[PDB]
Every structure is written in structure tokens, then in C-alpha cells.
């Protein structure tokens, strides 16, 4: 806890080099101990003080940290001539140790205490050892030369260590009858001092790697104590010899330095940052020997004397007015922030100058210099005033660099040899103009420009507009380096050519007022033009690369198209697009010399037209022809196809800025439509009729659309809009008599026909009739259509619903309804007693309850079928009497025995291979099952009343048996989840046991057909989990119909209570579909069984619906990945408008990878499905390239 206070937080990319060495303490030398000893006391006590000083001096000669590669000799004070060889793996340490001495015998380390006592003769042989002066004349304070641990060292800290000769004498303590070691008595004949300094040297020989030497900083301030301490150490000899790896000497502040750096090394620093901040420095790199003078009161003292060879990276003082002078080789100057003078030498010179100079900094370029780079790590382009025909860098505020040549006549020599970098990525170059040199912009790194200006969007055209605006000329050669794309630039021709590198790279387009743009085509390209913001816009042009495999798309959604016309010339189309007040021009030309006709243009978000259609309609002669104008139908925003039946639950996303949305109900048939709508969220302005005409308000309860017409509704965009509607075609009325014939074609657009005879009924004929009966039996099909209740009665009217199969997939629908057929007595069919009483009359004499006008048409010729209505009446009477060989299977919510969670129900008798499902318009489930047993014709019905309105509560699952021709028992287990009929067939005992070849299937009601069939003719070979779920993702990325209807049904069921309140009960049913963008991988880098871990973000957003939410659409750059979650239950619900689902997964949640599929990697779309996993807390969150997922 205490050591926590000595630590510091990590710093990133120091723009300027800072000092890092330790600072010396005050009075480290022997002068302090001499002053303390000066107090006249007992002599041996003074010696004890001296010896204590020597002990602490030798106690910490070296501190080694091989883990960080650091050596510390700051604590060395008594180990002189210390030579450190770093070439060996364990560095070699040599040097002299401070030693004890005696006036007569000198230093004799080879003798013991008794032998020394005999030599000098200060006691008797009998004397106890405790009475002898231990360590007299034979002690070495650095007792042993310390052993440096083996390691790889790159930073050496050097201390000022001298070797001391500790002169002593023998003092007889009479009161203690002992002999001790004492400082000599100065009162006697001439005495040698208690401590005498013998040497003041130090040496480190660098190895082969890069080493930094940091001598102790004794001159850190101009305080008088630090000044005199530096003065005392002004002759300390340092000997530094660098290796091939480079040597970085950071001068401590005082002494004699002898730096001999290897010329092979690329950089040999000499940093003066350890000196005081405001220190006037004058250094010349062309002089072998030099001295750094310190202005002490009334004179100078040479506090340094540096003899340097091989140094080429002079780093000036901290913030002091200095004079740096270079040599004939390449140099690098980290100048101070106090201004001064930099007289560079020959060769190539680089400089790093900080911001907020306290004095103008004068750069003098010698006649021998060839090139110059000036780095401005802290300055942005906004602070430089564009002075013309001058090389000096001028600041808007603060002092400015004042570059001058040694001779101004050769100022023109720096053509292209004076580059000025900048923090924001701008790289200026001194280019020669007509009669001089002007600093012009050569490069623009978009990365650093984004870093400096993240608020500003990284548009190259915006950037160049800024450069032109501020008054900075542009070099004929401009490189827009950085990013995924390169822009080559010829301002003379005013030309921008794009170099697309990646494939299917979405790139947005923006015209310029002054600089025409050229767009290079690549497969999968897709550009957007926004609303032009300026007058007098120079045109645009695109070289199209039509591969007919990955066609490009030019988009005009955000341009707000108002006035669009086109023209042809020279095998290229010139277009003009005008907004409400601005204008812009386009030139599409083909590198293949021909028009691709594949680059479809989306001028409007739902009016997308292929280039081929435009080039057909556009005349060949080169004259303007208006192809689009805003005076036509308003912006087509949400198209709704009316021939779809039943609930469709129209939805569109909200846009706050526009606050104007258009829903267009489009009819493609010849029958008038009435939309019986019901607004659930949102409001209406009415229906548009004319451009400059107020919209007449229209009730949403009923809207009329004429055949082959469009109805436009304008909706406010402040809140999300969800509308539920149920459309039905206008029934055609047939009232006349006689014989009439109509074929399949003329009324397949029509959904309902109604007959109201006046005197005689017409002879109804339906040519090309294709009756839908599961079995050929007439009586069995009659029972099937009558047992469900599909035959309906309304007082004296009869309605019957029949189906037809056409070439298009699915089933049609058509109802026959006849009024007045039942007599007045037969209008009371609601009473079962009266119906039972009338049944014998119906069997005996039907004509007693038969209308006379309908007597002649008791049978209807439905093409290949004959409908005998008396048979329908008799069969209905039979069913009614039997109710009050076929039985009804009904189930409830709380009935059933115990992935397949819920309740179990089973039908006793087995079915056939094919299956058929029926869905009543009221919302009842009527699963249809067969018997495969001909001895009585009878089928099974599974009834789930109120299923549509209550499938969320329902959790039941059905079971049935399957016999085969070879007597094979196959178990079928079916689960109902809305529009999904997830059926499972298992051979069970077939060819093995407990290892069944499990096959999967499903049926989805598309366009709301109340009958659906599944023959299961082939179904491939095996329908595995991967087949299922990667199939669903494959269809949903392509926006198929099954995924669309499940999404629509889910969204409709989300509003059972009226508002956005999705209970946890449904979320277990609903899977989770996520769309993400990733940069790149290597093929097959993920496999099944691996684990993902979601990143440490606040939340990861998931959407249950992707079709009408518009999330799976291609957007951005890179590859797209679609993730399929089986069970996402446990994720909280975020603040969403009623209609949009957005659930937030908590960070940490693990996912289990299954069946990662990369078939469509050439399409840059990958399908991946995961599992729920748990708190195991393992996995990976990023791609091998470092790119993060779930964006």
C-alpha cells in the first residue's frame, strides 16, 4: 500500500523527449561528513562517523533489475575506476575499493588482526580479541566486488564514485583498557587528511544492443547548492564507448565526458534534457571537443567538457534559448521550446520543434545541406498562416519558425527538399512556383486527421476544401495516403481518381464545387450521393466496371431528387440532377467502351431503375429529356402489395429529420379493393391527389383503391408507425340469367363471386377448374369439406369455399355464395330441434324447401367437377344428426403428459407420408391427418381453437406413427411455433436402435393461405440442425418469404395487449438474429465446438425481426456475418418504440459455435449460429486481425 504511492500511470506516445535520470541529493560527498566530524569530540567517534559514511557508500554499489533491463550505480560512492563490460552475458564489473591505511605499514589486506597487531605493535600478545581494533589497516569498504546477475541490460545509471584512502591511527582508550581506530590528531606534525581522494573515473563499454546511459543529474536547478555541487564534480571523468546498436547518453550536468559511439549505429543521441530548463546552451557537433559553460556570479565555469565522436542526434535543453550547430552528416535536432538558433550542417537534417515557442526559432540551412524534414508533433495545420513565397513557418498566435538559407540567392535550391510534417497528418512540401518557392500540401494521412478532428467526418473532398479555403496551395502531386482507399490528385486538371483496393467496398460519393471527381468501378461497389450544399458545382464522372456478376449501384437517396434529365454522347451518358434549389452533373462512361446495363440506379428508395431501362427510354440524339421530376408522384417510401390477403401489419421506420413518410398501397389487379384498416400507432394526413392541393382526410376504417391504381398515405415521422389492415377484393356480382362462361384467367385476380338471380339463376361455369381434394373419393372429400364447418349458412344464404391449384406455388381461393336458397321455414337453422324436424323432409322431398328459381340449377358445373348441392344438404343434415366413422380430437391448454418443452399429445392411429395443415380465418388450428387404412375411409383432425390468438401460451406438441410398405415403424414428432410447423421424423428401430437418422421439416403459411401441403418428395438426404438453421439464415439474407411471414407474425403477436409489452413467455420461442460487420478472416478459421465471448461493452443489441426492421441489409464496408441464437431468454428489453424489438444481451455471456458456414464467402456474407453456453467465462472476442465483433 505504501509502495503504491511511488508508482506512476503509463503515458502513451510522448510527443517530446523528456528527462528520465535520477536527481542527485544535496551534499552526497565527503564534505558533509567532514563538517560533522569537525566537531571536536573523541577521535574514535569521528572515525566511527567516517566509517559509517564509507559503509553506506559501499552498501548499495549496484542495484540490478534484469526483468526491466536496468542497472543502478547511483548508490556507488566508494568504488572508483569502475569499469562495466556489457559484452559478456553476465556483465563484468571491475574497479578499485576504498581501503583502510596506516602511517607505517600502509594497507595490508593479506594479514589478520593478530598479524597486523604484531606488525604495528599496539598491544600485548595476551590481549583479548575484543580489545583489538578490528579491521585496522586491512579493511576494504566495497568488501567484495559485487556480482551482477545475468541478464540483458539496456539502461545503465552511473553514479559519481571515488576511491578513498581512509587514513587512521591507533588510540588507547585507557578507561576501557582497549585499543580503537581513530582519526589522526591534526595538532601533531603535518598530518595526512582522514579521507584522501585517489581517483574520480568511471567507464562503461556498451555491448551490441541499444544502451542508454543516465549519469546522476547533479545540475538540475540553478540553486546555489546544486551549482556548487556541480562545480565540485566538474572534473569527474566518464568514459562511454557505444556499440553497433547505438548509444544514448543523457548528460548528468557536470564532468568530463568522452563519448565514442560506433559509426555503424543509425542513431547516437546526446540529450541535454537533464540540465536546468532555462539554460543557455551552445553546442557544435562539428567540434571534437567542447565545453558547456555555466554563468556563475561574475564569470563562467566549464561545468562540462564533452569530447564526442559519432553523435548525430543532438537533443537540446528543455526550454532554454540554445544554439545547436550540426555537422556534415545526417542529423536530428530535438530543439527546445525556448526558441534559439539551429544552424544545420550538410546532409539530411530532421527537426522536432514543440508548440508555444517563447522566442522565434531561427533555422539556418548551410549551403551543403541537401534535404530537411521539420516535424511539428504538437502543432496542427490550423495554426500556420499561409505566407507566400517564403519558407518560414508562421504561426497565427505565438512565435514562429524563421527558416533562412546561409545564402538567400540559393533559396531556390530547396525544390522538393523541404518537408514539414504536422500532427493532423498533413505533410507540406516546399514546391517551386513560377518565380520562387511556396509551401504546398503534398500528403494527407486520414488517420491522424480523424484523430485530431473526430467531429469532422473523414471526407477527402471536405479536407481538400478546407485546404483550399485556408489559403494553402496544392502540389500538382497529391497523395491521399491512409484508409482503405487511395485518391490520386491532379489539381491542374482538377482531377480526383479513386483507387479502390478491396472488393464489394461501399464508398460514398460527394461532388465538389471546384474539383471534378472520377469514380473507379469495382465489383460489388455501391455509392451514395447526398444533398448538394453549394452553388456552381463542378460535375461528377464514373468509369463503370460492369462484370455482370457483382454489379455496381449508384444511389441518389440522400440527394433529394427533384429535377432529373439525361443525354448521350461518345458512348457515355451525361445526367443532370437538381434539388429544390441546387444542381449537380454526372457523367457515366464505361471502361469496356460499352454500357453495363447492370448498374441499377436507386434514385428513390423504392423507385430503383436499371441503367438498361433508362438507356432504352433516353433518346439517342444529344438533347435533354426530363426523366424525373418532383411534380410527379411524391417520394415512394413504403410499397404495399394489395393482393396479399388478411392481416399484413404494415410497418416503416421512423425518421425524425424528414418527419414525412409515404405508404403506397398498390393494386395490380382488375378488381377494386377496400382496405378495412385499423390504426394502432401513428396518424394520417389523408390521401394525396394533386401536387398543389390539400389532402382530403380519409377514414382509416375504410380506404378505396380502384383497379390498377395507387393509394398514397402521408404519415408523420415523429413517432414509429404500425398499422394493421385486412384487405379483401370486391366480389363480382352476377345477377342475370342464361348461360355464362368464364375461364381461370379472367377471375384468378378475383377472390369472391356472388350470385343474386332475379328470375332465373345463371349457369355458372369455371373453365380450367382444378379441384383440390386430398383423395379422389367424392363422398370422402364431401365429408372433409363439410366436417370442419367450412360450409357456412347465413339465414337463407349458403357460402362454400373452394380451392384451385395453378402454376404458381401455393393455392388460390374462391367462394360461392347464393342468397335466398333456403326457404322461409329453413331460416331457423340455429334451432337444432327445427333442423332435426326438417331433416326427414330434406331426405324425402327436398323440393318442399327448395326455391323454385333455383330448382333448375341444383347442380353447378365447376369445370371438371360437378357440385350437387342436394348432396351437400343431405351430408350436412347427416353430420348434424350424428353430432347430436370420423371423430374429433380436441385439446386444451392444460392437457398433456410429460428443446421439445411443454405438453405431449398423440393420435392413436397412424397417418400417411404427406401432410396437410388448415388454418381457419377466425384463428383456429385444424391439423389434418390421414389413416392409410382403406377398410373405412376416415381421417383425423387435430383441433386447437383460438390458436392464432393464443399460441404464446400454447406449448403442446403432437406425436404420430408412420407405417411403410416394408412394415417400417417411423415416429413423427411435431411442434407448433406460429408459422413454423417443426416436424421431426425418426426411423427409430430402423436399421439400428437409439441411433436414429433424425430428419427435419417445416411448413410456413405464406400470403395467408388456409391450406398448406408437404409431400416430402426428396428433402435432400438428411435434414440436420445445420441444414435447418443455416437454411433459414440463407433465406433471410436473401429476404425470402417464409422468414418474412414468421417475422410479420411475431411482430403482430407482440401487440396482443396493444402496447410494446413482450412477455418472457414468448422470448423462449423466439430465436435471436443478429447482423454484424467484420473486416476479414482466413478461410475456415472458426469451427464447430469453439466458443465466442461477447466483448466488454455495455450491451450488445439483438433484433428478433430483420425483414421489416431493415437490419440485415448490406451496409458499411467489409464482410457481413449473420448470427443465429436458439435461446436468448434472459436478456432485458430496451427502450423501444412499439413495433421495433431490440433486446440487450449482458456482457460476459458465452456462446457455443455450431456449424459455421462459409459457402458465400465470395459474396462476403457468412452465416454463423451460436448456442447459449453459460458463465464458463472462456472464449475469444476479436478476429485474429484484432477487429471487434458485434458492432
DSSP state letters, 909-967: S---SSEEEEB-TTS-EEEEE----TTS---EEEEETT-GGGTTT--EEEEEEE--TT-
C-alpha cell at 1068: 423462449
Cα dihedral value 944, 949, 953, 957, nearest 10? 30
C-alpha cell at 200: 574520480
- Distances, alpha carbon 536 to alpha carbons 460, 463, 511, in Å: 19, 19, 11
DSSP 74: T
d(C-alpha 663, C-alpha 674), whole Å:
16
Q: How many CA atoms lie within 13 A of 225 on its CB side?
A: 8
**How many degrees, rounded to 5, is the angle at CA 21 between CA 19 and CA 23?**
110
d(C-alpha 320, C-alpha 295), whole Å:
14
- Specify the residue for cell string 539556418: 364
Residue 851 near residue 823 (C-beta atoms within 8 A): yes
**How many degrees, rounded to 5, is the angle at CA 1037 between CA 1031 and CA 1043?**
65
| Residue closest to 727 by CA, chosen among 802, 649, 653, 799 | 649
DSSP 856: G
| Residue closest to 111 by CA, chosen among 145, 135, 143, 127 | 135
- Distances, alpha carbon 922 to alpha carbons 34, 646, 812, 975, in Å: 110, 11, 19, 21
Bridge partners (DSSP) of residue 1013 are: 916
Taking the alpha carbons of 353, 358, 359, 360 in that order, is the dihedral positive or negative? positive
d(C-alpha 779, C-alpha 689), whole Å:
55
Residue 674 near residue 730 (C-beta atoms within 8 A): yes
Strand blocks (E) in 1040-1128: 1072-1078, 1091-1093, 1100-1102, 1119-1125
Residue 1092 near residue 1137 (C-beta atoms within 8 A): no
d(C-alpha 512, C-alpha 490), whole Å:
14
Strand blocks (E) in 630-776: 638-641, 646-647, 650-652, 660-666, 673-681, 684-687, 703-705, 710-716, 721-729, 732-734, 752-755
d(C-alpha 864, C-alpha 773), whole Å:
13
Q: What are the helix (H) ranges across 716-768?
A: 744-748
Taking the alpha carbons of 121, 122, 128, 133 in that order, is the dihedral positive or negative? negative
Taking the alpha carbons of 588, 591, 593, 594 in that order, is the dihedral positive or negative? negative
d(C-alpha 94, C-alpha 401), whole Å:
49
Q: Which residues of 144-183 are buried (b: 16+ CB within 10 A; e: fewer)?
A: ebbebeebebbbbbbbbbbbbbbbbbbbeeeeeebbbbbb
Tell me whether residue 685 is exposed, middle or buried, using C-beta atoms within 10 angstroms of its C-beta: 0 to 12, 13 to 18, 19 or more: middle
Residue 719 near residue 1137 (C-beta atoms within 8 A): yes
Residue 264 near residue 247 (C-beta atoms within 8 A): no
Residues 6+ apart with CB under 8 A from 1100: 1074, 1094, 1144, 1145, 1147, 1190
Q: Which residues of 231-262 are buried (b: 16+ CB within 10 A; e: fewer)?
A: eebbebebebebbbbbbbbbbbbbbbbbbbbb
d(C-alpha 818, C-alpha 795), whole Å:
11
Residues 6+ apart with CB under 8 A from 149: 64, 66, 90
Residue 864 near residue 772 (C-beta atoms within 8 A): no
d(C-alpha 799, C-alpha 40), whole Å:
132
Residue 1144 near residue 1100 (C-beta atoms within 8 A): yes
DSSP 509: B
Strand blocks (E) in 1057-1099: 1072-1078, 1091-1093
Taking the alpha carbons of 379, 383, 387, 392 in that order, is the dihedral positive or negative? negative
Q: How was this structure determined?
A: cryo-EM
d(C-alpha 251, C-alpha 270), whole Å:
7
Chain centroid to CA 764? 65
Q: Give the pairing of strands 1132-1133 and 1143-1145.
A: antiparallel
Specify the DSSP element, H or E, that contains 267: none
Residue 558 near residue 533 (C-beta atoms within 8 A): no
Taking the alpha carbons of 102, 104, 108, 111 in that order, is the dihedral positive or negative? negative
Residue 1169 near residue 1033 (C-beta atoms within 8 A): yes
Residue 37 near residue 194 (C-beta atoms within 8 A): yes
Residues 6+ apart with CB under 8 A from 1113: none
The angle, 0 to 180 degrees and rounded to 10, between the axes of the packed helices 869-883 and 778-787 is 60
DSSP 1040: -
Q: What are phi and psi of 1182, to 5 degrees?
A: -130, 160
d(C-alpha 1102, C-alpha 1125), whole Å:
10
d(C-alpha 714, C-alpha 849), whole Å:
54
Chain centroid to CA 495? 33
d(C-alpha 354, C-alpha 40), whole Å:
56
Residue 177 near residue 128 (C-beta atoms within 8 A): no
**How many degrees, rounded to 5, is the angle at CA 21 between CA 15 and CA 26?**
135
The angle, 0 to 180 degrees and rounded to 10, between the axes of the packed helices 832-844 and 869-883 is 140
d(C-alpha 476, C-alpha 4), whole Å:
57
Residue 721 near residue 700 (C-beta atoms within 8 A): no
76 torsion bin: left (phi>0), alpha (psi -120 to 50), beta (else)? beta
Residue 876 near residue 790 (C-beta atoms within 8 A): no
Given strand 1100-1102, what is the order of strands in its sheet? 1100-1102, 1143-1145, 1132-1133
DSSP 1182: B
What string of H, E and C letters represents the secondary structure of 26-72? CCCCHHHHHHHHHCCCCHHHHHHHHHHHHHHHHHCCCEEECCCCEEE
- Distances, alpha carbon 867 to alpha carbons 239, 775, 857, 859, in Å: 118, 16, 10, 5
C-alpha cell at 963: 407405417
d(C-alpha 260, C-alpha 245), whole Å:
13
C-alpha cell at 289: 571537443
C-alpha cell at 425: 497528418
DSSP 630: T
Amino acid at each position: 500500500s505504501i509502495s503504491l504511492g511511488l508508482t506512476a500511470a503509463s503515458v502513451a506516445f510522448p510527443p517530446l523527449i523528456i528527462a528520465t535520470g535520477p536527481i542527485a541529493a544535496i551534499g552526497m560527498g565527503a564534505s558533509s561528513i567532514a563538517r560533522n566530524v569537525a566537531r571536536k569530540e573523541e577521535r574514535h567517534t569521528q572515525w566511527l562517523e567516517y566509517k559509517k559514511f564509507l559503509t553506506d557508500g559501499s552498501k548499495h554499489i549496484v542495484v540490478a533489475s534484469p526483468e526491466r533491463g536496468l542497472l543502478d550505480f547511483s548508490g556507488n560512492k566508494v568504488f572508483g575506476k569502475m569499469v562495466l563490460d556489457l559484452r559478456q552475458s553476465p556483465p563484468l564489473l571491475h574497479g578499485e575499493s576504498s581501503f583502510n591505511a596506516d602511517r607505517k605499514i600502509g594497507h595490508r589486506p593479506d594479514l589478520g588482526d593478530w598479524q597486523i597487531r604484531e606488525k604495528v605493535g599496539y598491544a600485548n600478545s595476551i590481549s583479548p580479541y575484543s580489545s583489538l581494533a578490528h579491521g585496522y589497516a586491512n579493511s576494504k569498504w566495497p568488501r567484495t566486488i559485487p556480482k551482477i546477475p545475468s541478464g540483458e541490460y539496456d539502461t545503465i545509471i552511473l553514479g559519481y564514485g571515488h576511491q578513498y584512502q581512509a587514513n587512521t591511527e591507533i588510540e588507547y582508550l585507557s578507561n576501557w583498557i582497549v585499543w580503537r581506530e581513530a582519526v589522526p590528531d591534526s595538532t601533531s606534525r603535518h598530518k595526512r587528511p582522514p579521507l584522501e581522494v585517489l581517483n574520480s573515473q568511471c567507464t562503461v563499454i556498451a555491448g551490441e544492443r541499444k544502451t542508454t546511459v543516465l549519469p546522476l543529474r547533479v545540475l538540475s536547478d540553478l540553486t546555489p547548492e546544486c551549482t556548487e555541487q556541480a562545480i565540485s564534480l566538474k572534473d569527474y571523468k566518464f568514459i562511454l564507448r557505444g556499440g553497433s546498436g547505438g548509444l544514448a547518453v543523457q548528460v548528468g550536468g557536470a564532468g568530463y565526458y568522452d563519448i565514442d559511439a560506433n559509426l555503424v549505429a543509425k542513431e547516437n543521441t546526446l540529450s541535454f534534457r537533464g540540465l536546468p530548463e532555462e539554460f543557455p546552451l551552445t553546442f557544435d557537433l562539428s567540434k571534437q571537443t567542447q565545453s558547456v559553460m555555466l554563468k556563475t556570479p561574475d564569470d563562467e565555469v566549464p561545468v562540462m567538457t564533452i569530447t564526442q565522436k559519432g553523435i548525430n542526434t543532438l537533443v537540446g535543453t528543455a526550454a532554454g534559448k540554445d544554439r545547436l550547430i550540426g555537422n556534415d552528416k545526417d542529423n536530428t535536432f530535438h530543439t527546445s521550446s525556448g526558441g534559439g538558433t539551429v544552424i544545420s550542417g550538410g546532409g539530411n537534417n530532421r527537426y522536432i520543434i514543440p508548440r508555444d515557442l517563447k522566442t522565434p526559432l531561427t533555422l539556418t540551412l548551410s549551403s551543403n545541406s541537401v534535404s530537411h524534414e521539420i516535424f511539428l508533433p504538437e502543432t496542427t495545420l490550423a495554426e500556420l498562416k499561409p505566407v507566400a513565397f517564403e519558407l518560414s513557418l508562421i504561426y497565427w498566435a505565438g512565435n514562429n519558425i524563421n527558416v533562412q538559407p546561409e545564402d538567400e540567392a540559393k533559396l531556390n535550391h530547396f525544390a522538393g527538399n523541404f518537408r514539414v510534417h504536422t500532427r493532423d497528418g498533413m505533410t507540406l512540401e516546399a514546391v517551386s512556383r513560377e518565380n520562387g518557392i511556396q509551401l504546398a500540401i503534398s500528403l494527407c494521412d486520414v488517420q491522424r486527421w480523424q484523430a485530431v478532428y473526430p467531429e469532422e467526418n473523414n471526407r477527402p473532398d471536405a479536407i481538400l476544401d478546407r485546404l483550399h479555403d485556408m489559403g494553402w496551395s496544392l502540389t500538382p502531386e497529391v497523395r491521399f495516403q491512409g484508409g482503405e482507399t487511395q485518391v490520386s490528385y491532379d489539381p491542374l486538371t482538377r482531377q480526383l481518381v479513386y483507387q479502390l483496393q478491396a472488393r464489394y467496398s461501399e464508398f460514398q460519393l460527394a461532388g465538389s464545387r471546384h474539383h471534378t471527381t472520377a469514380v473507379t468501378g469495382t465489383p460489388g461497389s455501391r455509392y451514395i450521393i447526398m444533398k448538394p450544399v453549394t452553388t456552381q458545382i463542378l460535375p461528377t464522372q464514373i468509369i463503370l466496371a460492369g462484370d455482370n456478376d457483382h454489379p455496381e449501384t449508384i444511389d441518389l437517396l440522400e440527394a433529394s431528387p427533384v429535377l432529373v434529365e439525361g443525354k448521350k454522347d461518345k458512348n457515355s451518358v451525361i445526367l443532370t440532377i437538381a434539388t429544390i434549389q441546387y444542381s449537380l452533373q454526372l457523367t457515366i462512361s464505361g471502361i469496356e467502351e460499352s454500357l453495363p446495363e447492370t448498374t441499377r440506379v436507386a434514385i428513390q428508395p423504392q423507385d430503383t431503375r436499371l441503367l438498361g431501362d433508362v438507356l432504352r427510354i433516353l433518346p439517342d440524339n444529344g438533347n435533354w429529356v426530363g426523366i424525373f421530376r418532383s411534380g410527379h408522384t411524391p417520394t415512394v417510401n413504403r410499397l404495399e402489395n394489395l393482393m396479399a390477403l388478411n392481416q399484413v401489419m404494415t410497418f416503416l421506420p421512423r425518421v425524425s429529420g424528414s418527419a414525412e413518410q409515404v405508404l403506397c398501397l398498390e393494386n395490380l389487379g382488375g378488381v377494386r379493393k377496400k382496405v378495412e384498416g385499423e390504426l394502432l400507432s401513428g396518424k394520417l394526413k389523408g390521401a394525396w391527389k394533386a401536387e398543389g392541393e390539400p389532402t382530403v382526410p380519409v377514414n382509416i376504417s375504410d380506404l378505396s383503391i380502384p383497379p390498377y391504381s395507387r393509394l398514397y398515405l402521408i404519415f408523420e415521422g415523429k413517432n414509429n408507425v404500425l398499422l394493421r389492415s385486412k384487405v379483401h377484393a370486391a366480389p363480382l356480382k352476377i345477377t342475370s340469367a342464361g348461360e355464362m362462361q368464364l375461364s381461370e384467367r379472367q377471375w384468378q385476380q378475383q377472390e369472391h363471386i356472388i350470385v343474386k338471380p332475379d328470375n332465373e339463376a345463371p349457369s355458372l361455369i369455371l373453365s380450367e377448374f382444378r379441384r383440390f381434394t386430398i383423395s379422389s373419393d367424392k363422398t370422402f372429400s364431401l365429408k372433409l369439406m363439410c366436417h370442419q364447418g367450412m360450409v357456412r349458412i347465413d339465414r337463407r344464404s349458403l357460402s362454400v369455399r373452394l380451392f384451385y391449384l395453378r402454376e404458381q406455388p401455393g393455392i388460390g381461393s374462391l367462394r360461392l355464395t347464393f342468397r335466398d336458397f333456403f326457404t322461409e321455414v329453413m331460416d331457423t337453422t340455429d334451432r337444432e330441434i327445427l333442423e332435426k324436424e326438417l331433416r326427414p323432409i330434406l331426405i324425402g322431398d327436398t323440393h318442399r324447401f327448395i326455391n323454385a328459381a333455383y330448382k333448375n340449377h341444383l347442380n353447378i358445373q365447376l369445370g371438371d367437377g360437378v357440385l350437387n348441392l342436394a348432396d351437400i344438404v343431405a351430408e350436412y343434415a347427416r353430420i348434424q344428426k350424428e353430432e347430436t366413422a370420423i371423430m374429433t380430437t380436441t385439446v386444451t391448454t392444460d392437457s398433456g403428459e410429460l428443446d421439445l418443452s411443454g405438453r405431449y399429445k398423440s393420435v392413436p392411429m397412424a397417418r400417411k407420408a404427406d401432410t396437410l395443415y388448415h388454418l381457419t380465418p377466425k384463428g383456429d388450428l385444424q391439423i389434418i391427418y390421414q389413416v392409410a387404412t382403406k377398410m373405412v375411409n376416415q381421417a383425423m383432425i387435430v383441433s386447437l381453437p383460438n390458436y392464432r390468438h393464443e399460441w404464446e401460451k400454447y406449448n403442446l406438441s403432437i406425436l404420430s406413427e408412420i407405417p411403410q410398405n416394408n412394415n417400417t415403424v417411423v415416429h413423427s414428432i411435431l411442434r407448433v411455433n406460429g408459422p413454423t410447423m417443426q416436424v421431426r421424423t425418426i426411423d427409430y428401430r430402423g436399421t439400428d436402435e437409439n441411433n436414429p437418422i433424425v430428419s427435419f421439416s417445416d411448413t410456413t403459411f405464406i400470403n395467408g393461405e388456409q391450406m398448406l401441403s408437404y409431400d416430402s418428395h426428396s428433402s435432400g438426404r438428411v435434414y440436420s440442425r445445420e441444414e435447418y438453421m443455416m437454411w433459414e439464415l440463407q433465406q433471410r439474407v436473401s429476404e425470402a418469404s417464409s422468414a418474412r411471414t414468421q417475422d410479420y407474425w411475431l411482430m403482430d403477436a407482440a401487440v396482443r395487449n396493444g402496447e410494446w409489452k413482450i412477455t418472457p413467455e414468448l422470448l423462449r420461442h423466439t430465436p435471436g438474429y443478429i447482423r454484424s460487420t467484420v473486416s476479414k478472416w482466413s478461410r475456415g478459421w472458426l469451427k464447430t465446438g469453439t466458443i465466442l465471448q461477447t466483448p466488454e461493452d455495455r450491451n450488445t443489441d439483438v433484433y428478433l425481426t430483420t425483414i421489416q426492421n431493415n437490419v440485415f441489409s448490406r451496409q458499411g464496408g467489409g464482410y457481413q456475418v449473420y448470427y443465429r441464437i436458439d435461446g436468448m431468454a434472459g436478456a432485458d428489453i430496451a427502450d423501444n418504440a412499439p413495433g421495433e424489438t431490440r433486446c440487450t444481451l449482458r456482457p460476459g455471456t458465452c456462446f457455443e459455435v455450431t456449424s459455421v458456414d462459409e459457402r458465400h464467402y465470395e459474396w462476403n456474407i457468412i452465416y454463423v449460429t451460436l448456442k447459449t453456453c453459460g458463465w464458463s467465462r472462456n472464449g475469444q472476442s476479436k478476429t485474429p486481425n484484432g477487429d471487434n465483433l458485434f458492432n
